[PDB]
Amino acid sequence: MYYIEELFCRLANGVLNNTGIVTDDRGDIEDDSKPFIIVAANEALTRLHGRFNMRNNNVVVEMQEGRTNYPLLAKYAVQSYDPNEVKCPFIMDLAGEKFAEDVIRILEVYDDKGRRRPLNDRNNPCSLFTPRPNVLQNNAPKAWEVLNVMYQAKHPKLSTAEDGYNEIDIPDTLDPALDAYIAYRYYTSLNTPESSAKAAEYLSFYDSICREVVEYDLTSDTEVDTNTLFRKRGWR
Amino acid sequence: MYYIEELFCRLANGVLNNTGIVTDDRGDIEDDSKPFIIVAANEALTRLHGRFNMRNNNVVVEMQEGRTNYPLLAKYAVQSYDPNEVKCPFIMDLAGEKFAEDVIRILEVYDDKGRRRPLNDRNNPCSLFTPRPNVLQNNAPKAWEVLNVMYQAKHPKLSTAEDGYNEIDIPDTLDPALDAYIAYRYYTSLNTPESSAKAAEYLSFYDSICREVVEYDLTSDTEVDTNTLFRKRGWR
Amino acid sequence: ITTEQLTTREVGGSGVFDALMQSASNHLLAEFKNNRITGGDYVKAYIATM
């Protein structure tokens, strides 16, 4: 769990060593070229977190009387809402963290009483729908009703603006993939044939590393559970 | 969900660094080349929303006595109609939601009494037809009859004219596809042998990202429902 | 005779090299305004004569 400065130093030493971005002493990236690296790093992190299912997060949503669509944004969080615009927030961040907007896909939704709620099931009247990938609907809000949403998450945004997220949390085996993606972006943006060939090399390296990680299952992505349909179907 | 200025600064600090569109500080696009980027962005958004089925929206249409064809245009919306041209509008809007034409495909049509209406069925007398993709037909209008149209929608139009929509609603996994499409358009427009070679790369990158997103099903496009034909057919 | 009489480091003119480039650019643009070539052909010919 290293900060953004360690990433800048590791880039200044590793790939992009020979380029003109790096300072004279080869210690750090120059100031005017930092937003480019930040954008590339955010894109790479989103790619990896979409591919691998490394992060599983949770959020709590409370149900208001007249609202049916509950978009999952930071506007309606307790730790981030603006009292003037939003009168009452419905996303609770009481304990810790700030709920950065990182909803990729919704997996499970559980009621406050411990019962599961079906998702996107047309033929079940008591189901929940998602008109948009992060918006959630319940067509019959009730009093004292709360839903827990279990979703796949992506890495929070890096900004380096004295209020954004400095730290990077990624498995140690996936650092070269991120560095290769950043180098690919830069060498592609150079707009020369030799740099284009180098960019092709780096992208192929990224793909090969990801495929190797999938081969050896280093992120424990595969999941297997105990059989439960043997008893439901009536077998003896 | 982010402003249009974030898109301009992402294109100024990502791809298109080495081009002559960007300003001297490379922080934003010059005023001369913003219409080009807006046209490209609208085209890319239409492509993605046609492919992926992200947004699902709704319209309420009430039926007049002597009308059978009901085009879905803003000329007949309450907030946008011209009183002298149109005597009485039939599409209901709200002062905040003014119903920009964003109809790609019509999925479901429901009566005001909660009963489903068959669509484009030749052998059913009590069905609705669409002569054109944005026009409805009802051959027997009746008193106190209103219809709800459930349709797939596209992104609203970006205008940057102090009245158009500044924001962009798109999942964070598909930002590189939009950027790659814009870069493809810009690099094809140059009409040089090297620019075309770069544009082919950008278009292939867009295609590969879209195929990957389909492969991992990050937008939850696949939908499955419980089986109800078991009871209808008479099985036990 | 000084350097500034050869080229004044500006696209405008007042030099032999600048005038020699501007005349060729004018001829190519004259052919370009008629729908006979595009921007790329004009740019390539300009760079070639440079």
DSSP secondary structure, A119-147, as one string: BS-TT-SS-BB-SSSSEEE-SS--TT-EE
Report resolution (Å) to 1 decimal: 3.2
**Which of B2, B44, B73 minimizes the C-alpha distance to B207?**
B44
**Which of A91, A121, A42, A105 minimizes the C-alpha distance to B176?**
A42
Q: Which residues of B touch C38 (CB under 8 A)?
A: 191
Decide: residue B153, CB within 10 A, 0-12 exposed, 13-18 middle, 19+ buried: buried
CA distances from B62 to B70, B91, B107, B126 (A): 9, 7, 18, 17
Whole-number Å distance between alpha carbons of B110 and A165: 47
Nearest 5°: CA angle at A11, between A9 and A17? 110
Q: Tell me which amino acid residue A26 is.
A: R
Alpha-carbon distance B139 to nearest alpha carbon in chain A (angstroms): 29
Scan residues 190-209 of B and list those with Cβ closer than 8 Å to C: 190-192
Decide: residue A138, CB within 10 A, 0-12 exposed, 13-18 middle, 19+ buried: buried
CB–CB contacts below 8 A, B to C: 8
| Local structure of B110: helix, strand or coil | strand
CA distances from A57 to A15, A101, A159, B48 (A): 33, 11, 21, 28
Q: Report the residue of B172, B187, B225 to disrupt the A interface, i.e. the one with the largest count of A CBs within 10 Å.
A: B172
Decide: residue A206, CB within 10 A, 0-12 exposed, 13-18 middle, 19+ buried: buried
Query: Which residue's entry shows tokens 């944005």?
Result: B134
Reading across the β-sheet that carries A146-153, which strands appear in turn? A56-62, A146-153, A103-111
Q: Which residues of A touch B9 (CB under 8 A)?
A: 35
Q: Which residues of C touch B190 (CB under 8 A)?
A: 39-40
**In the structure, do chain A and chain C come into contact, i.e. share 3 or more CB pairs under 8 Å?**
no
Option in B16, B175, B225 nearest A122 (CB): B225
Q: How was this structure determined?
A: cryo-EM
Q: Which chain C residue is nearest to residue B195, measuring alpha carbons?
A: C40
Whole-number Å distance between alpha carbons of B152 and B139: 24
Query: Which residue's entry shows tokens 């939850």?
Result: B220
Q: Which residues of A touch B226 (CB under 8 A)?
A: 121, 123-124
Alpha-carbon distance B190 to nearest alpha carbon in chain C (angstroms): 7
Alpha carbon distance, N-terminus to C-terminus of chain B: 51
Please list the residues that pair with A110 across neighbouring strands. Answer: A116, A148
Q: Report the residue of B13, B217, B221 to disrupt the A interface, i.e. the one with the largest count of A CBs within 10 Å.
A: B13
Rg (CA), chain C: 13
The residues, ordered by sequence, that sit 6+ positions from A176 with a Cβ below 8 Å of its Cβ are A205, A209
Query: Which residue's entry shows tokens 């992200």?
Result: B54
Asked if residues A166 and A160 have their Cβ atoms less than 8 Å apart, the reply is yes
Asked if residues A23 and A30 have their Cβ atoms less than 8 Å apart, the reply is yes
Option in A120, A131, A189 nearest B18 (CB): A189
